DNA sequence: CCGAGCAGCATCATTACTTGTGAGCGGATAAC
DNA sequence: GTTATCCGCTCACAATGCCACACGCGCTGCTCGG
RNA sequence: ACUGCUCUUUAACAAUUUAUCAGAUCUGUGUGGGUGGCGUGUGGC
């Protein structure tokens, strides 16, 4: 009853995807699916409709690394080191890697449930920063966000109208810097 | 741009300073209400505190706040703390002496992040934010250029609430007066620290300070090129209420000068 | 300071990227990445290895010499360390001070 | 393309011709060096190798040599000389028979 | 779609005869 | 075994000055960008 | 058809404590202000 643990291997700067591909391909090559459970590359999908990048954006939990459900053995070890573009086994001493803890797996998977559940636009806003308005009704004016909302997403923002400052309910789509 | 929390804090400080100034011209309404050994807490302090807290709650109903009066009002997000002194040097206010300031600092994860002090009388606004520096109404603050003890002006506060160390303090005072140029005694540790940030005093030291008074100045002098320390170079000051600060060389000279006279109680 | 490590351009958008700027870019990139990981639930082995990599990067910045090489791109030769700007016949001592 | 263009463009050996004098040009085409990849460098060149070896006679000139740091490391091929089918230096001689 | 910018890369084995000297360290070698 | 002794090996550290002239000095699949 | 019958001539004050006889500057447009670092190579002495 060989329980395949979870290990992590260093990928390269901009190679992670094709690395995971080639990994599964070499698994199929040696038919060692029993030894290699799943190659996990967690990611994130931050969604903004305008502001350059539009309607989506793809982040990752952490670059340069790939997560595998391998089982520990020298054969599997070289099977992962006989791949195009990886570094050694991220962990303890080389040729004797350190499987990541189960708590790590559980926490990361809770992270994945959270991120995949709600498409959460990052580059968020903080109550107290000043910001302009690129929208028709208040073109190029500038006030301070007095409250940030996410579901309603309507930027309670104090701005100067008729002398007295007053809140305004303009949406994210028209905010300036910050 | 600008730092957000800094902005909301400076709004709070503006409102509080305006309230204090408005009440400063009716000494028949603000009475002397003592709390401990000559630490008055007048009703105006309570009003300014309430105003500041209200203004904050609009933008952070979740941040835990600290205040000498209301102790520690917990918040649903207690990773960030708001330390306040609505009034510094209550005695200087009750005597209607026009030299005092309100101090608001925001710590994140324990490390102080932003600080502001506001003197309404002279209308001076010392702001400071880590990673951007310190400003006095738009001027950068690089403290005093002193590099010795001669010609140096030393601001200080006296342990007039912990008078047991008086002799000790006075002892060191004498020692200091053998090397420095002149002293300053204003009565508001926040404003003294601020002056250190503005170079208007070549350094500063004090014994017996509450943790909610230097929190608005220590970051000020830090981002003002100066440094702080305990009376021995450590960092237990946040608990001992014993501060010594100034530009680095002057701090070194002062520490090497004081280490001998120091009563081992403070060590 | 920015002056002593200048970024002089060329006839076009070609800038002489002094090695100091590149090493600083690398180390600050590692620092930002590692901090962003620290707030993001910090998988232990990952933060460990990233701390090691950041130590290597700051090491290279203070001195490209020890523990290995950090040669520049497109030019198989090391990057000018800070120590480089002091030692040797090119450092400020034997080049501009004396 | 990158490899071949990097060789022919930026290599320790490649260099635009010393083209100011027909003789200079010629003597720069038939120039033998010991520096460059695979070769030793002038700092650690060693005081010995720079010397002329009696097997040089007729094979590589003992006179033409840049005076300076790199002496002997930059020689010039003899006139009648020729490269062998392997890469050695052959020299023509006359087959002396009985008398 | 497709051109222009860009972010962190040992890009496998990328090897590499000495240069001469000094200092230090891990480990053989011998006294108590 | 201890205890120090010394030795083989490793690694760091130095390489004339000037000049002059010449030549050259990111990239590459991610990022963005409309 | 089948919860629905007058309630009775318009906003409804904060101001507050020695004290008093009120107790010259409205200028300029004189002017400085509107490609290099590194590496490599060569050669020279
Ligand atoms: Mg106070």
């Amino acid at each position: 009853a060989p329980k395949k643990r979870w290990y992590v291997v260093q990928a390269f700067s901009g190679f992670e995807g094709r690395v995971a591909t080639s990994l599964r391909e070499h698994i199929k090559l040696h038919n060692m699916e029993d030894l290699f459970g799943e190659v996990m590359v967690p990611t994130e999908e931050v969604v903004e409709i305008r502001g350059g990048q539009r309607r989506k954006s793809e982040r990752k939990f952490f670059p340069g690394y790939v997560l595998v459900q391998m089982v520990m053995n020298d054969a599997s070890w070289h099977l992962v080191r006989s791949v195009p573009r990886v570094m050694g086994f991220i962990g303890g001493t080389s040729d004797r890697p350190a499987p990541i803890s189960d708590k790590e797996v559980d926490a990361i998977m809770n992270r994945l449930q959270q991120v995949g559940d709600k498409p959460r636009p990052k580059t968020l806003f903080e109550p107290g920063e000043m910001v302009r308005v690129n929208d028709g009704p208040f073109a190029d004016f500038n006030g301070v966000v007095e409250e940030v909302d996410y579901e309603k997403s309507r930027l309670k923002v104090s701005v100067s109208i008729f002398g007295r400052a007053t809140p305004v309910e303009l949406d994210f789509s028209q905010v300036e810097k910050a | 741009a600008m730092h957000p929390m800094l902005n909301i804090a400076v709004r709070a400080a503006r409102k509080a300073g305006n309230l204090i100034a408005k009440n400063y011209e009716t000494p028949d309404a603000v009475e002397a209400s003592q709390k401990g050994s000559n630490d008055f807490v007048t009703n105006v302090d309570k009003a300014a505190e309430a105003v500041i807290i209200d203004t904050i709650r609009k933008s952070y109903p979740q941040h835990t706040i600290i205040t000498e009066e209301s102790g520690e009002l917990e918040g649903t997000d207690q990773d960030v703390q708001w330390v306040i002194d609505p009034l510094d040097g209550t005695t200087n206010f009750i005597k209607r002496l026009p030299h005092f300031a309100v101090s608001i600092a925001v710590r994140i994860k324990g490390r102080t992040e932003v600080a502001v002090v506001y003197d309404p009388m002279r209308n001076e606004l010392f702001t400071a934010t880590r990673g951007q520096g310190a400003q006095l109404n738009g001027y950068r603050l690089r403290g005093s250029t002193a590099r010795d003890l001669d010609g140096t002006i030393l601001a200080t506060g006296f342990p007039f609430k912990a008078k047991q160390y008086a002799t000790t303090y006075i002892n060191i005072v004498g020692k200091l007066f053998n090397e420095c140029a002149d002293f300053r005694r204003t009565g508001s540790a926040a404003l003294d620290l601020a002056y250190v940030a503005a170079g208007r005093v070549d350094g500063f030291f004090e014994i017996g300070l509450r943790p909610w008074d230097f929190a608005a100045g220590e970051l000020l002098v830090r981002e003002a090129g100066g440094i702080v320390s305990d009376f021995t170079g450590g960092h237990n000051y946040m608990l001992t209420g014993n501060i010594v600060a100034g530009n680095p060389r002057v701090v070194k000279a002062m520490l090497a000068n004081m280490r001998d006279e120091l009563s081992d109680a403070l060590k | 300071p920015p002056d002593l490590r200048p970024l002089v351009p060329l006839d076009g958008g070609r800038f002489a990227t002094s090695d100091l700027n590149d090493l600083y870019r690398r180390v600050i990139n590692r620092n930002n990445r590692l901090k962003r990981l620290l707030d993001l639930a910090a998988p232990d082995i990952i933060v460990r290895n990233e701390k090691r990599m950041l130590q290597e990067a700051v090491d290279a910045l203070l001195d490209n010499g020890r523990r290995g090489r950090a040669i520049t791109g497109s030019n198989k030769r090391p990057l000018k360390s800070l120590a480089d700007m002091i030692k040797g016949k090119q450092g400020r001592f034997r080049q501009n001070l004396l | 393309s990158a490899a071949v263009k990097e060789f022919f463009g930026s290599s320790q050996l490649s260099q635009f011709m010393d083209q100011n004098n027909p003789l200079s040009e010629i003597t720069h085409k038939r120039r033998i060096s010991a520096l460059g990849p695979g070769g030793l460098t002038r700092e650690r060149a060693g005081f010995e190798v720079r010397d002329v070896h009696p097997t040089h006679y007729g094979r590589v000139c003992p006179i033409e040599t840049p005076e300076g740091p790199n002496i002997g490391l930059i020689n010039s091929l003899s006139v009648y000389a020729q490269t062998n089918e392997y890469g050695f230096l052959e020299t023509p001689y006359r087959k002396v028979t009985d008398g």
Side-chain angles (χ1 to χ4, degrees):
Chain A
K3 181 166 184 47
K4 38 185 189 321
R5 300 292 326 283
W6 271 81
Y7 290 71
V8 55
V9 191
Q10 186 191 169
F12 280 77
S13 57
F15 274 144
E16 286 204 347
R18 75 189 68 251
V19 170
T21 71
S22 158
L23 264 292
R24 275 169 271 96
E25 319 315 316
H26 295 192
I27 305 169
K28 298 182 286 188
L29 165 69
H30 279 60
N31 208 33
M32 297 324 180
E33 288 81 2
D34 58 355
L35 305 197
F36 287 162
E38 164 61 26
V39 286
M40 161 58 64
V41 54
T43 184
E44 300 212 26
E45 292 81 3
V46 162
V47 291
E48 56 275 11
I49 71 157
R50 307 199 207 284
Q53 187 33 258
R54 70 280 189 191
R55 283 81 187 251
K56 70 98 179 176
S57 65
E58 165 178 344
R59 286 319 172 214
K60 324 178 179 308
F61 274 5
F62 36 83
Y65 308 117
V66 289
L67 303 172
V68 303
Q69 203 196 12
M70 72 175 287
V71 68
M72 165 51 172
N73 60 84
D74 306 330
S76 54
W77 194 95
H78 277 78
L79 280 158
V80 192
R81 289 300 302 278
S82 64
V83 313
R85 39 203 71 89
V86 297
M87 299 220 186
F89 270 11
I90 288 300
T93 177
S94 42
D95 83 8
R96 177 67 186 275
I100 210 170
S101 157
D102 55 357
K103 295 189 163 309
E104 313 289 322
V105 165
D106 209 73
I108 288 305
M109 295 327 287
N110 287 32
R111 290 256 301 145
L112 180 58
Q113 301 137 27
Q114 284 190 4
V115 61
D117 199 77
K118 45 187 82 171
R120 272 221 162 263
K122 294 310 109 179
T123 78
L124 56 88
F125 288 1
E126 183 68 37
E129 56 212 352
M130 52 184 179
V131 56
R132 298 164 21 94
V133 168
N134 51 73
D135 200 357
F138 296 108
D140 307 86
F141 292 138
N142 50 4
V144 60
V145 53
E146 208 160 352
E147 184 272 354
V148 52
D149 48 337
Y150 279 144
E151 280 61 29
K152 190 200 180 180
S153 45
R154 295 314 303 288
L155 269 290
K156 186 71 66 66
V157 166
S158 200
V159 73
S160 86
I161 323 293
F162 33 85
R164 49 166 296 165
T166 175
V168 163
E169 215 55 32
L170 181 60
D171 201 317
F172 286 83
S173 281
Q174 319 290 343
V175 307
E176 211 76 23
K177 64 180 176 64
Chain B
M2 208 175 189
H3 196 293
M5 291 192 317
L6 157 71
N7 200 321
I8 198 53
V10 74
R11 173 187 329 193
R14 292 291 289 291
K15 265 191 184 297
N18 266 31
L19 174 56
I20 288 175
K22 181 260 298 174
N23 275 323
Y24 164 81
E25 277 82 337
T26 179
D28 315 316
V30 56
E31 264 88 15
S33 294
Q34 301 172 357
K35 183 63 66 67
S37 88
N38 301 166
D39 284 332
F40 326 104
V41 174
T42 84
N43 44 298
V44 171
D45 198 305
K46 267 80 76 177
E49 192 271 347
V51 167
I52 294 175
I53 294 318
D54 169 78
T55 52
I56 290 157
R57 286 295 167 71
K58 294 178 180 176
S59 159
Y60 289 97
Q62 62 283 355
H63 269 165
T64 288
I65 320 172
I66 296 180
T67 299
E68 53 183 59
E69 305 311 310
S70 87
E72 183 190 32
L73 309 187
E74 215 275 340
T76 87
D77 181 26
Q78 74 153 11
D79 75 329
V80 166
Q81 292 207 312
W82 285 58
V83 58
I84 312 291
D85 182 349
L87 166 60
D88 210 44
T90 80
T91 175
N92 274 111
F93 178 76
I94 278 188
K95 291 300 169 171
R96 218 174 76 177
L97 197 146
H99 178 293
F100 40 87
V102 55
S103 87
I104 295 91
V106 181
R107 293 174 178 168
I108 289 189
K109 310 308 193 304
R111 172 184 74 259
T112 296
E113 203 268 0
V114 70
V116 294
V117 304
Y118 187 98
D119 164 28
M121 297 327 289
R122 307 170 183 278
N123 191 28
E124 319 202 81
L125 168 69
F126 303 74
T127 175
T129 179
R130 204 174 43 78
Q132 292 192 17
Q135 322 159 2
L136 192 159
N137 316 327
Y139 302 164
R140 278 213 67 107
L141 315 174
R142 295 317 281 181
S144 303
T145 185
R147 42 189 285 173
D148 61 71
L149 278 191
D150 165 40
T152 57
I153 315 305
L154 272 300
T156 180
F158 292 13
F160 79 115
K161 314 160 297 298
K163 302 164 177 166
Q164 54 274 13
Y165 323 110
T167 176
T168 295
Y169 182 87
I170 293 302
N171 297 351
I172 321 175
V173 165
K175 187 65 64 66
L176 268 300
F177 199 54
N178 313 138
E179 318 195 9
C180 53
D182 188 11
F183 277 166
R184 285 304 183 272
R185 183 72 181 89
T186 67
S188 279
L191 266 173
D192 314 325
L193 288 175
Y195 285 142
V196 189
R200 305 179 184 178
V201 287
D202 302 287
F204 158 78
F205 68 97
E206 179 269 4
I207 177 172
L209 198 60
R210 294 320 302 155
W212 46 67
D213 292 330
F214 52 85
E218 76 90 11
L219 161 69
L220 184 45
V221 293
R222 274 194 197 278
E223 287 287 330
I227 60 181
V228 308
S229 298
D230 68 343
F231 291 168
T232 48
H235 277 260
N236 318 333
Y237 64 97
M238 281 186 317
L239 301 177
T240 68
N242 306 341
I243 319 297
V244 57
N247 70 69
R249 171 74 67 76
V250 172
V251 170
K252 165 64 158 308
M254 288 191 48
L255 265 193
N257 169 45
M258 289 177 41
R259 174 219 35 79
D260 52 10
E261 195 81 35
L262 177 49
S263 90
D264 307 351
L266 310 180
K267 308 189 181 184
Chain C
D3 200 4
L4 305 204
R5 54 176 214 281
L7 186 48
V8 56
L10 268 62
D11 62 292
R14 197 49 95 198
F15 290 70
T17 318
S18 57
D19 298 355
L20 275 303
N21 314 126
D22 218 328
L23 287 191
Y24 273 123
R25 286 218 291 102
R26 179 173 313 278
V27 58
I28 194 170
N29 223 357
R30 287 305 190 284
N31 205 28
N32 287 16
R33 164 166 311 176
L34 188 145
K35 163 200 314 173
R36 176 229 173 186
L37 269 68
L38 262 292
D39 54 75
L40 283 199
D44 160 75
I45 297 307
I46 293 304
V47 51
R48 187 94 50 89
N49 165 83
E50 208 72 25
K51 278 188 182 185
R52 199 221 32 72
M53 183 154 304
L54 176 133
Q55 167 73 28
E56 271 283 350
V58 59
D59 212 74
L61 187 146
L62 292 204
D63 188 355
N64 202 353
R66 280 94 186 191
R67 280 279 293 181
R69 305 306 153 196
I71 48 156
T72 186
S74 66
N75 193 357
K76 310 320 287 169
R77 51 99 169 177
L79 287 152
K80 299 305 197 315
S81 89
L82 285 172
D84 189 327
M85 294 194 68
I86 281 185
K87 69 180 181 64
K89 307 193 301 290
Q90 274 58 28
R92 289 292 152 276
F93 273 105
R94 301 172 63 172
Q95 190 62 256
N96 301 267
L97 266 298
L98 268 168
Chain D
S1 297
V4 72
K5 185 61 178 296
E6 210 279 334
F7 173 50
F8 285 74
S10 85
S11 177
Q12 161 69 91
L13 295 201
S14 177
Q15 50 210 18
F16 47 91
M17 194 153 44
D18 184 342
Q19 184 264 332
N20 62 0
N21 170 348
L23 166 68
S24 70
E25 177 173 359
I26 285 290
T27 192
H28 184 279
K29 303 193 188 182
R30 50 188 310 129
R31 159 154 298 177
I32 308 305
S33 158
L35 310 165
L40 71 163
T41 187
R42 75 182 54 81
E43 162 183 68
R44 62 194 68 257
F47 150 79
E48 166 44 54
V49 175
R50 311 164 177 268
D51 198 320
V52 58
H53 192 295
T55 57
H56 286 163
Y57 157 82
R59 297 200 163 73
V60 59
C61 171
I63 310 307
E64 166 74 18
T65 292
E67 165 47 66
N70 46 4
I71 305 187
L73 307 187
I74 305 295
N75 299 319
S76 88
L77 188 50
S78 313
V79 53
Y80 286 84
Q82 198 171 24
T83 183
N84 201 323
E85 76 184 353
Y86 287 166
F88 291 5
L89 284 182
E90 60 179 12
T91 286
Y93 298 104
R94 314 187 44 183
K95 176 54 183 173
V96 169
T97 318
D98 43 0

